[PDB]
Subunit: 423 residues, 4 copies
Amino acid sequence: QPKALKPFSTGDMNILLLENVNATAIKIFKDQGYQVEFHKSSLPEDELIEKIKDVHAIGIRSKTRLTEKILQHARNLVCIGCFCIGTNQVDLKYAASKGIAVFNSPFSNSRSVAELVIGEIISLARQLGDRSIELHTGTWNKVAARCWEVRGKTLGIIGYGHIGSQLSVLAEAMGLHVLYYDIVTIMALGTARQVSTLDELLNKSDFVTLHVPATPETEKMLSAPQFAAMKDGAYVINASRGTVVDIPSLIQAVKANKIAGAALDVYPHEPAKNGEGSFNDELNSWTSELVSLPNIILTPHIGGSTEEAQSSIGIEVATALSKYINEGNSVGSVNFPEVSLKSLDYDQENTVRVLYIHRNVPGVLKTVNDILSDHNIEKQFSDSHGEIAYLMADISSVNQSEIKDIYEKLNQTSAKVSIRLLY
Amino acid sequence: PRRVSITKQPKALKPFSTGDMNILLLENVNATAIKIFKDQGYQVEFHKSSLPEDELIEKIKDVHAIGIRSKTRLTEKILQHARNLVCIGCFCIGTNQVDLKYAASKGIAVFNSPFSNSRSVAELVIGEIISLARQLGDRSIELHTGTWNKVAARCWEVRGKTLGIIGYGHIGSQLSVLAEAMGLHVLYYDIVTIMALGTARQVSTLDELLNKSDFVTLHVPATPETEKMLSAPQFAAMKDGAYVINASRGTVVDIPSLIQAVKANKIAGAALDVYPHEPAKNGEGSFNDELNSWTSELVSLPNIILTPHIGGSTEEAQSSIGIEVATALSKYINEGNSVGSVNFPEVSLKSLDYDQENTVRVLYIHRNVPGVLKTVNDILSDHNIEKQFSDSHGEIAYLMADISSVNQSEIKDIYEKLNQTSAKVSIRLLY
Amino acid sequence: PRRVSITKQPKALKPFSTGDMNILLLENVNATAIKIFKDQGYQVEFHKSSLPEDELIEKIKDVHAIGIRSKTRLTEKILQHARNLVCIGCFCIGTNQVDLKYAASKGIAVFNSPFSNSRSVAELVIGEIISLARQLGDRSIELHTGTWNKVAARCWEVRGKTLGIIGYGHIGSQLSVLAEAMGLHVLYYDIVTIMALGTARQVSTLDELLNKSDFVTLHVPATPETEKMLSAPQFAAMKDGAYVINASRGTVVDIPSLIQAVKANKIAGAALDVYPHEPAKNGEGSFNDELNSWTSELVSLPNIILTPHIGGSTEEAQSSIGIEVATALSKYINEGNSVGSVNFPEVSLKSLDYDQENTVRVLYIHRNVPGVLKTVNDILSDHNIEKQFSDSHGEIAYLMADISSVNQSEIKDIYEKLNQTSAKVSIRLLY
Amino acid sequence: PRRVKQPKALKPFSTGDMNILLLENVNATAIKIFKDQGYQVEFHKSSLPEDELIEKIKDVHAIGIRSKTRLTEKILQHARNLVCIGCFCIGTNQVDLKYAASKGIAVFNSPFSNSRSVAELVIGEIISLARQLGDRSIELHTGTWNKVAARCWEVRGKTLGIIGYGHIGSQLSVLAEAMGLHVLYYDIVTIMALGTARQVSTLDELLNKSDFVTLHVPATPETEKMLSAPQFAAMKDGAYVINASRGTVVDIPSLIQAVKANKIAGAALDVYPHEPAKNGEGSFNDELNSWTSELVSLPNIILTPHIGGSTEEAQSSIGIEVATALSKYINEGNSVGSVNFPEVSLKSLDYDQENTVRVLYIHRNVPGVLKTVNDILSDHNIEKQFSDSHGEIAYLMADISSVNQSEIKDIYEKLNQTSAKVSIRLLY
Ligand SMILES: NC(=O)c1ccc[n+]([C@@H]2O[C@H](COP(=O)([O-])OP(=O)(O)OC[C@H]3O[C@@H](n4cnc5c(N)ncnc54)[C@H](O)[C@@H]3O)[C@@H](O)[C@H]2O)c1
Ligand SMILES: NC(=O)c1ccc[n+]([C@@H]2O[C@H](COP(=O)([O-])OP(=O)(O)OC[C@H]3O[C@@H](n4cnc5c(N)ncnc54)[C@H](O)[C@@H]3O)[C@@H](O)[C@H]2O)c1
Ligand SMILES: NC(=O)c1ccc[n+]([C@@H]2O[C@H](COP(=O)([O-])OP(=O)(O)OC[C@H]3O[C@@H](n4cnc5c(N)ncnc54)[C@H](O)[C@@H]3O)[C@@H](O)[C@H]2O)c1
Ligand SMILES: NC(=O)c1ccc[n+]([C@@H]2O[C@H](COP(=O)([O-])OP(=O)(O)OC[C@H]3O[C@@H](n4cnc5c(N)ncnc54)[C@H](O)[C@@H]3O)[C@@H](O)[C@H]2O)c1
């Protein structure tokens, strides 16, 4: 059985959710007794600074920029939830220096990207995109030439991680052979086979799919030589990062009848907001040329744009913020020492949890364990991350009177960054 | 279990009183058929399109087997001139383009490929389940015209959703296995009880399927009972925001009712491969209100996938069609095998051992009237009948017999005696 | 997938000029056979043992079908007295106890159950693979005599080991899927190329299987090439501490060599179900040096499992035999269907629709000489032959014909004429 | 899926050579793992007499035992240098765990390493009982040829009743279905079924509908003799009972009656209420268990000397599991998975983290101890620290950053002089 913990003082917890986090997060926060403010869009800096001064936790996504300019006004902010993969929109170092833990959902889009690729393998192999554009404009063009059953073909997976490995099992289920290249040796799932070099994957694959991070080594890793290494009439699918494919080379290989089709979800330059005129030659010089090619599927970075994906994002990040607020748990934080302890058995009464964010300088634990020396330390865990560190301690026989004293002593320590007490 | 049969070599048979076999293939049959036909020693004439009635009438008088597809119409008008035509291959599903009854009355067996498109249609629906669930068609049309529209609202991971398969036959049962592999629950309705594949579950009524499914797929034949079988009432029984896929027959969905359910936000997306009226040839401007009154309206709707009846348009499907029907025609010509014919008694016999020399196979198509076997087994009475099989299909019947100890002299005599019988429709001897 | 076959119900047929059918079942065939026969309206006489030659000759004179197993000897001596015997069922694999040639010359079709024991032998081997791997036989023998001997040395988890299957037939292929399911690697040697089940791999030579296998199991027929195919040379090619299982034939393993390889600690354990010489009846002292010289030495060895040829000794196996052979005889009695007969031309026709009234099925077993079908189709010439099939097997042949519009009066004439023909061996009409 | 800076291997501060004592014939994988660290290993195939053990344990740093060796306060009181105890088996009752803990000795075991071996064992015995193979082979070894098909079964189509759907049971489930069994399972908690197995609400439903009943439950007061007459009467005529769990779960007298009354057709027993401590003849008799000679007289009963986990693979996995655990506790502070000890560990240190020392502080769970320790360490940066308590003892692991050779000896003596100290080790 578990022991629910409360925060000494503070009053009700205030959550600010921006950019339309999924309702699963809203339900979780409300079920904690938190007060939730929800917005479907981001906020202008003025409205955001005003709303953030008294907020305890903020949930954002890709567009909201939490810089020092806005975080300096965050008086009560305990943690930040990024309900997405990227954390670049948050000044992680500054947030850490003020004891604000930041969380994300890194792998919540794996299934959605994998299902996307399965659909696009089939669409490219059958030219569904072109056929449907044709009928929507009156053209009847029944084509069986060079249209393929996906059964029996070979899928080349570049990057056999979270997405690649799930795509592997789906591809075999559809009857594909799976070859994968990766810069590390990975145990294959099902009947997939890893190949030593990229060129072997390119030579032997009918479908080439990219699921790699953005690194200097992945920058334009598929260009003219790599397209030349592929099979005549093979297919390229890129739902990874916009830098991984050299688009001019792809346009050339397609225009030269070397590549039979392509599906692009990511681009070197992408619009900051949705709009009618946003995808054009000013954004990417080759756009008007890319748009003129047959059997290219273009998607506005929708690799993770599903209800389920956002629902999983909601649960992971809301649960994470909930465990950090209610317990202290920082595991999985992107800028913060990863610290946690087993929850309390409910019957362990008069037990208090000390959450002490401080500077990573000698003597701090000396000070803190002195302050706590009149009580039995049941459990203690302290870890450091750069110039900050984080201490969790469970103390045994503490009554209401001595919580104020233990708290006020810790709040007066020289190395303190942030202190919370949990009942 | 599958093993290389290490028994006695078969005795390849050659037709009596004939020259080289002439095959006419129309409408761009796949190369797998041409290879099989040439490997039989046949003489193959190949055309990418059909033939006009005049040019076809002259060409068919000396043809032994004709290969067609959907467009070539082999009516009594043109078949009257087929003096040497042994069999007709339809390298497609439909046989309506052939006068099957007349072809039978002249002893011409017809073969088709009914189920060669199963895999291609099944994968088609999988891609379309995903495309509709993710709105791929709309997103991609948007980018080709400059519009950037990242949307996650009511775009779905397909895992955990329910596929409603209406018609659990060759395509449906194969779609079932693919669907579960993609993580869907599969429900199927059919007018017959069928053993489910994997963990699919058959439902008693159509409405139960419609109420419980997220994706509804049609894989039914064209019958009076399937005519517009999904219409306004059935869309009302479906889930809010459900998806309709029809890659079966163009009459099975009432399109005006579908358009209405889409405009009323009841149906979230639809994928149509077949239509009440379809063009006869590819071309621009072919798909419009003159073909189907509601086209301009259907085209204006969001998240609708429209395909020009490409459910079986794959290299593999056409390759299997080529192999299936060419093998069928070849075995009927070279052996006598009529199993799988659409207009003809289904008759065959085990091949003869290489060492069964001087054995001849009689292929005797005749009228289904008493006394014929009396005549035939009389004519054959000086030889031992090794095997014999005769079966009837309406007014015609077909006799295969293997008779032993036959020399060249006795082949001409047996042939003309059988060729002189009153009940004869067509006679071939295989030596 | 399996479907509710929607066709017209069949027209159950009853023999002309005969009364109730008399079935004689000997040697304790399973009750599933008795049930099927009684449900046909047949009269069933059942015995737990065979019959002495005197009682058998008298009882067989008026019996229509006889069911036997291994011990009943149906020779010419006793079959010459069988006036009404239409068919013989062997509810086992072996048919040597039946004079197949003589029975055929008198028009008596024989059926058996060749493969009904496949599942039982496969499960037997799985259980023995584990028992040999864990020395279960010994451990349990040990405690039954007071000895406590917990041993992990050289006892193995079966997961990860390699099973060598010699003979990848009915039993072997079923053993393959069970073995992989138990986590085994499967290699198989066979004199034929066979497509492997699951992820099994066929090896080119027997020695490759022997070198690479942890468990070697034999599932081969008895042939000159299989006699003693595992002896000292083959044991020398196996792995140190490998295992031999023989549930095939008593000739395939050289037991003195196996005893030699075990005593040299080369073979770690063995499971034997079959032996060069086996007792005729169950009893103590029956398995000894007089039966096989090496018995007393074989029993002295550790971790050898010995079973009294119980490979097919399950309720299910005997039940499947009951279903198989009783169904086979029933279809041959009720419909003429001789497919699967071991001594007889294999002949059958699609059954007739309930409504096809006045349709008669002619069953004509005869001598394989020219002119017979001339005669028969003469006799039937006043009626339309709907279907006819005749095949030959050595000196006999078998004619099935369905003839249309036949009344009670003209059935007796057709029968008496056919009964008078010179080539007749046996004639039955089904009405 | 599984995928391919190196850690800074730590050495105990100024100590001697490591001494490992391995008893009861532990698998060679444990010996190999220990020697690869340079440890000194003494190996024995059997246990040791109490006299020889007391002398040998005085100077040993780590001991590996199994079920028979009893490490009581009598023998552990002489353990001067004993840091940890490895139980290369499941049971730990043969060790006085509290006494070991009060002296700062962590104890480790291998709880689930035998799952596969017991599961395959039951498969073999399901088949052996379904065919009464044991009897047939005993018969031929004494000359009797008795070909029987009556009441012998193909296992396909039958129902396996798994009682206790835990590590072994769940693994048995998939194997049973692969063999063609229908699987029903009873357990006091709702558990997600593997494959197509189905949980039954009550034990009686499992007994009524199963052909083969197998027990995979812990030894608790609720399982004590849980299958007795009332249960056997609820089973099908000619059903089979397999017990490879604990010797108390089956009421053997009721089973003998059910076999004698032809109600139960066969049984396979691997565990027993009383079992010998060592292998030998005559050890399994009426003096050990009153009903032994009568149980042995029954047809189609498989008896095995507790060999459910007696496979090379299982013992190799036990060897790897426990030796790794003991090695990580010695070479690092890692006590996760110990049966008597606070579970404490920290991420290992990067090769490049020079002059870093790891403090391992066993102590009494009383207030003020951490006050003392972080004072002693206050001149150095605490990179990481973790302390947890377990009853009367507690265990502190700490990484300190800038420490030279001079400053280690002082840190050691200070911690070694503390009032609450039970055991202190420093890793350099
Ligand atoms: N389109 C979308 O909406 C969307 C959604 C989620 C993720 N993504 C992106 O897709 C990519 C894959 O995500 P994931 O979670 O599967 O990643 P991951 O970190 O789990 O796996 C990436 C794999 O790529 C391999 N790799 C790295 N560099 C490589 C190189 N140069 N060549 C070959 N292999 C290399 C790594 O070893 C690893 O196995 C990431 O870049 C992620 O940001 C896109
Ligand atoms: N789009 C294409 O290019 C393409 C290609 C091949 C086939 N098809 C068409 O798809 C359909 C399915 O082909 P198939 O080979 O799977 O057919 P099939 O004959 O194997 O199976 C059809 C199933 O529908 C069931 N059924 C019949 N009437 C029904 C009714 N009223 N309600 C419900 N179920 C009913 C039948 O019992 C059967 O199981 C056919 O009409 C075929 O022409 C289309
Ligand atoms: N022990 C029993 O009670 C019992 C029960 C049933 C069957 N059997 C016996 O088991 C054997 C197997 O039965 P089955 O139905 O599986 O047979 P099967 O006919 O299905 O298969 C036998 C296989 O052995 C192969 N083979 C033949 N000669 C070979 C050789 N020299 N080397 C390697 N492979 C060779 C064949 O190619 C074939 O694949 C038979 O002898 C049968 O009598 C025993
Ligand atoms: N024979 C051997 O050599 C050997 C080897 C290993 C384990 N075992 C024994 O086998 C048993 C199973 O081991 P495991 O590792 O799978 O155990 P486990 O702890 O993983 O699972 C036991 C299961 O039994 C259930 N259970 C407990 N009490 C129950 C009751 N009264 N009724 C029904 N279900 C009940 C529990 O819920 C649990 O699901 C243990 O007792 C273990 O000691 C014996």
